[PDB]
Amino acid sequence: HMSFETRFEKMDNLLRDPKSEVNSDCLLDGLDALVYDLDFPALRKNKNIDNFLSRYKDTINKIRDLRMKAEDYEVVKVIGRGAFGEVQLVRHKSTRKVYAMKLLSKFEMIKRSDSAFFWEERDIMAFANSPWVVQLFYAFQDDRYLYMVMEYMPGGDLVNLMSNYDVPEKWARFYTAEVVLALDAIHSMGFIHRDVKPDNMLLDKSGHLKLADFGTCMKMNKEGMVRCDPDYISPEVLKYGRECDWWSVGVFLYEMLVGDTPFYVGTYSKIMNHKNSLTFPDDNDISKEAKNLICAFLTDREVRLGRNGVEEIKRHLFFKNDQWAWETLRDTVAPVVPDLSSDIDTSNFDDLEEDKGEEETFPIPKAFVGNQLPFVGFTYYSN
Amino acid sequence: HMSFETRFEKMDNLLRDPKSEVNSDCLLDGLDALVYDLDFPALRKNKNIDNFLSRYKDTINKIRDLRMKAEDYEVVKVIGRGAFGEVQLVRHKSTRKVYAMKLLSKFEMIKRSDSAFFWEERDIMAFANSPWVVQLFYAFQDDRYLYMVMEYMPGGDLVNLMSNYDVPEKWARFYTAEVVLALDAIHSMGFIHRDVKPDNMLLDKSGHLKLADFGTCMKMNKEGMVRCDPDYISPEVLKYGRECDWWSVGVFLYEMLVGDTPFYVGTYSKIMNHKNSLTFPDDNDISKEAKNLICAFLTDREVRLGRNGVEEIKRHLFFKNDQWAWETLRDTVAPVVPDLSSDIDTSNFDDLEEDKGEEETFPIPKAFVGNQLPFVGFTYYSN
C-alpha cells in the first residue's frame, strides 16, 4: 500500500544496493545457473527447455566472455590449501595487479552436502570495510569453482612467525592488541567468529595484522548471542555469546609465551575444569601482567573478561606501553616488517605443490538436478 | 580481448538498454519463473531446490508486491476478445489513468504449443515510437497471464465505422493515407506485417488512425524479405517481401468503396488469376482514380506498386487533395471525430460479456516442467 512513484524507486535501490541478493550481478548468476543445469541432451528433449536454451544460448555465451572469469588471472603459485579448495597468488592479466584468490570445489561441496558456509565469509570480507579485515574486491562463480579475489597478505600467518622466532612479551602485547581490535570490528557488524586461531591471523606488507578465513561464523541474534547445537572451545560452547571469542584470544596469548596450548579426547574435561588445570612452566619469566590477562580470559563464561565490554580489555596494564596507544596502534612500526624483493614474493608463505590432479565432475543428469542452484547470488563486484 | 574498463562498461549498458533481453527487468522474470515452476511439494524433496527456494522465498514474495501486478488495475469493461485471451479497459488505481490491457492465457498458449508470437508484437509496440502505432507503456507477467498495458483507442476499429456509415471517397482517401504511413513506419523498423485487416486499424480520440494487434509479424531478412512456408493473401505468399503488405491495402480500399471483398476454399484460385477476376459493381460511381489505385495494388508481385518505394504511392493523384498534405496529414481534422462523454466511454466499442469462467490450470508436476520458461524476458517498463 504505497504510491507507484515510491514503489518504483525502491525496486531500483534493491537492484543497486550491493548487499541485496537481487543485485543485478546476483540475477545473472540465476540465469547462468539455469543454462548450466539445463543444457543436457537428456533434459533438452523437453520443448520448453529446448527453446528457452536456444533463445538465450547466443546471449549467455557472450555474457560469460565479458563477466569476470578464471582466464583473466594467471596463477603465480599456491600459497595454501585446505578442505574443499585452495588459495592462489594471482595476477590480473589486464590491470597487472596481484591478489590472493580462494577457490572452492563445487563438486566436493555438493558431494559431502556442505554449501552454506561461504555466505558468512563473503558478507564479512566485502562489507566489513575495516583495516583489520582482509577485504574482498571481486567474487565470481564458474562451471565447477567459486572464486574469491582478495588482497594479498605477503607477511604470512602467525603460525610461521611463532615457529621462526622466540616471541618476547613486547611482540605478544602488539599482536594481541591488533587481534583485540580486529575481533571487535567483527562484533560491531553483528557476527561472532569461532575458533579464532593463529592460522587466521595474517600479516600485511607493513607487518600489521588482518583477520581472514571466516569459517564457523554466524550472525548475532536479537539478544546479541547465538543458539547453536577443538581446544579453542570455551566451557560456554562445550556445555553461545561474544564471550566465546575472548576465550580463544586468551589461548592465543598463552601459546605465544608458553609455547604450547593451555589445555593439552579428554581434553574437553580439562576445559570444563578450568579452575584446577591452569598451569604455567617452571621458569615462568612470563610477567605477572600476562599471567593475569591470560587467567582473566580463561575462566568461566560468567566472570570471563569482556562480558561488560571491549573497553575492559583495553584498560588492562598488559597493553599499557609507551610506543603506541590504541588509536595510533596501526600507525606505529610493527615488530616484524617482512622484507620482500619482488611484489610476488612468497618467502613468508610455505611452498605447496601445484594442482596436478584430474578434476572430478558430476554425472550428466536425466532430470533437473539443480547442483548450481545453491551458489546463486555469490558474485560480487567492487566497482 | 578488451580492457577491463571497457568490458565492465558494456555490461552496465546491457543491463540498462531496454531492448536487451538481459535487462534487469528481464532478469527478475527468470528468477520468478524458477520459484513458480519449482515450488511444488513433489519437487521440493530435492534438497538443493528446497534450500534455494527457502532462501529466496521471503525475498521474491516481497518483490511480487512491489513490481507491477494485476491488482493495480481495476477492470472497467471488456472491449474485445480473441484466441488465447482478451482485452480490457483498465484504470490504474494509484495514478488514475485509463489504459487498454491485453491478457494472454498461459495455459492455452502452452496447451496448444504456441508461445513465440507475442515477442514481435512487444518489440514493435514498445520501440516503434511513432504516432501511427499503438504504444506499449508497461508489460508484466503473472502465474497464469501475460499483460500488455497500452493506450486506450476510444474510436474503435474501422470495421464498425464502415458498417455504420456510407463511406465516401473523401473518407477512403484519408483512412488509406494514414494506413500507408503507418505501414511504412513498421517497414522502417525492419518488420513485415501480414493480413493487414480493418480489424487492426484503430481510431484515437481525434479520429486519426493507429495500427495494433501485430500478429503474423516477422523480421526482415538481410535482403529485405522473409523466407516462410485468408483473402488478404497475395499470389506472392500463396505460391515473401514488402509487396505482401501493399496487396492487403488494395483489398482494404476495395472494401470501403465496393462494400465487399474483391476475391470472393477455391478463393485461392481467384487470387492467382488476379488478371481475369478484377470485377467492379454495375453502378461503379467509384472514381477512376480509385479504380486505378486498387488495380495497381491488386496485381502480380513483380509489377505490384511499391516494389520501388513508398514514394510511388504518395505520387498517386488519388491522394492529391486540397485539405491536407502527407506531413500535415495527422494535424488536419479527421472525417469521424468520436464524441464521447466520459473518459471511460466505450460507445464505439462493442459490448462483450465479462469473463464468468473458471480458469483452467496446469496439473501439479512431479518433475521439472518449465511451463513459465518460454515467457522469460517479456516484462517491460517505460520509466
UniProtKB/Swiss-Prot annotation, chains A, B:
What organism is this sequence from? Homo sapiens
The listed locations are: Cytoplasm; Cytoplasm, Cytoskeleton, Microtubule organizing center, Centrosome, Centriole; Golgi apparatus membrane; Cell projection, Bleb
What is the UniProt domain comment for this protein?
The C-terminal auto-inhibitory domain interferes with kinase activity. RHOA binding leads to a conformation change and activation of the kinase. Truncated ROCK1 is constitutively activated.
Quaternary data: Homodimer. Interacts with RHOB, RHOC, MYLC2B and PTEN. Interacts with ITGB1BP1 (via N-terminus and PTB domain). Interacts with RHOA (activated by GTP), CHORDC1, DAPK3, GEM, JIP3, RHOE, PPP1R12A, PFN1, LIMK1, LIMK2 and TSG101. Interacts with FHOD1 in a Src-dependent manner. Interacts with SHROOM3.
Q: Where is the active site?
A: 195
Question: Which of this chain's residues are annotated to bind ATP?
Answer: 79-87, 102
Record function comment: Protein kinase which is a key regulator of the actin cytoskeleton and cell polarity. Involved in regulation of smooth muscle contraction, actin cytoskeleton organization, stress fiber and focal adhesion formation, neurite retraction, cell adhesion and motility via phosphorylation of DAPK3, GFAP, LIMK1, LIMK2, MYL9/MLC2, TPPP, PFN1 and PPP1R12A. Phosphorylates FHOD1 and acts synergistically with it to promote SRC-dependent non-apoptotic plasma membrane blebbing. Phosphorylates JIP3 and regulates the recruitment of JNK to JIP3 upon UVB-induced stress.
What's the PTM story here?
A: Autophosphorylated on serine and threonine residues. Cleaved by caspase-3 during apoptosis. This leads to constitutive activation of the kinase and membrane blebbing.
Its recorded name reads Rho-associated protein kinase 1
**Can you give the residue ranges of the Protein kinase domain?**
73-319
Q: Which residue range or ranges hold the AGC-kinase C-terminal domain?
A: 322-383
Report where it is expressed, by tissue: Detected in blood platelets.
Leader sequence range is none
Return the similarity comment: Belongs to the protein kinase superfamily. AGC Ser/Thr protein kinase family.
